[PDB]
Write a protein that binds this ligand. Structure first.
Ligand SMILES: Nc1nc2c(ncn2[C@@H]2O[C@H](COP(=O)(O)OP(=O)(O)O)[C@@H](O)[C@H]2O)c(=O)[nH]1
Length: 178
């Protein structure tokens, strides 16, 4: 019904553990936007709305509109996005797939982020290819996923990530081919 007009996309962050499940929600705060703000990483409530544009990106989920965390009625998706975090040093792992399986189950466009590019052992395009093995093809290749090869440790690609996000946030309406 017409009892909603503000639409904060619930960009659920997922992927494998140790690749930065919760650490990226910290890393993301210690990149910009929130420093003293009681959100994202505390205890009362989880995650937050990041200010790349104007807080239009609620990472993970918000109570009432859970997409990739839990599907209450499934159809909580309007034009939401999922982030799939894969360490370039580790790649696709057990729970990483389960995050993919949840994503493809709905068949939502992904925002992959290959972390640990701070590591000289980073193999981004390698672990990136494992995603396309679960049929997650980057838009650099012509599939349906925006990958980012970032390092949440050197705090490089977290900045580049929100850039790709805002790109999507701007094209959100009709832009994809045009
Ligand atoms: N090298 C590297 N390590 C990372 C990065 N992001 C997270 N980590 C590591 O991920 C580990 C697990 O993070 P934590 O939030 O405690 O665990 P999780 O939330 O269960 O994945 C941490 O000890 C970090 O060292 C990254 O971008 N690069």
């Amino acid at each position: 019904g017409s009892h909603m007009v503000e639409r904060p996309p619930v960009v659920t962050i997922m992927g494998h553990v140790d690749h930065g499940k919760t650490t990226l929600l910290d890393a993301i705060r210690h990149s910009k936007v929130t420093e003293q703000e009681a959100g994202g990483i505390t205890q009362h409530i989880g995650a937050y709305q990041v200010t790349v544009n104007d807080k239009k990106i609620t990472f993970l989920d918000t109570p009432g509109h859970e997409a990739f965390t839990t599907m209450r009625a499934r159809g909580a998706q309007v034009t939401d996005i999922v982030i799939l975090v894969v360490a370039a040093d580790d790649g696709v792992m057990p729970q990483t797939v389960e995050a993919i399986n949840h994503a493809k189950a709905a068949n939502v466009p992904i925002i992959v982020a290959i972390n640990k590019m701070d590591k000289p052992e980073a193999n981004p395009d390698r672990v990136m290819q494992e995603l396309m093995e679960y049929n997650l093809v980057p838009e650099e290749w012509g599939g349906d996923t925006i990958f980012c090869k970032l390092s949440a440790k050197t705090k490089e690609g977290l900045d580049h990530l929100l850039e790709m996000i805002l790109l999507v946030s701007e094209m959100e309406e009709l832009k994809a081919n045009p």
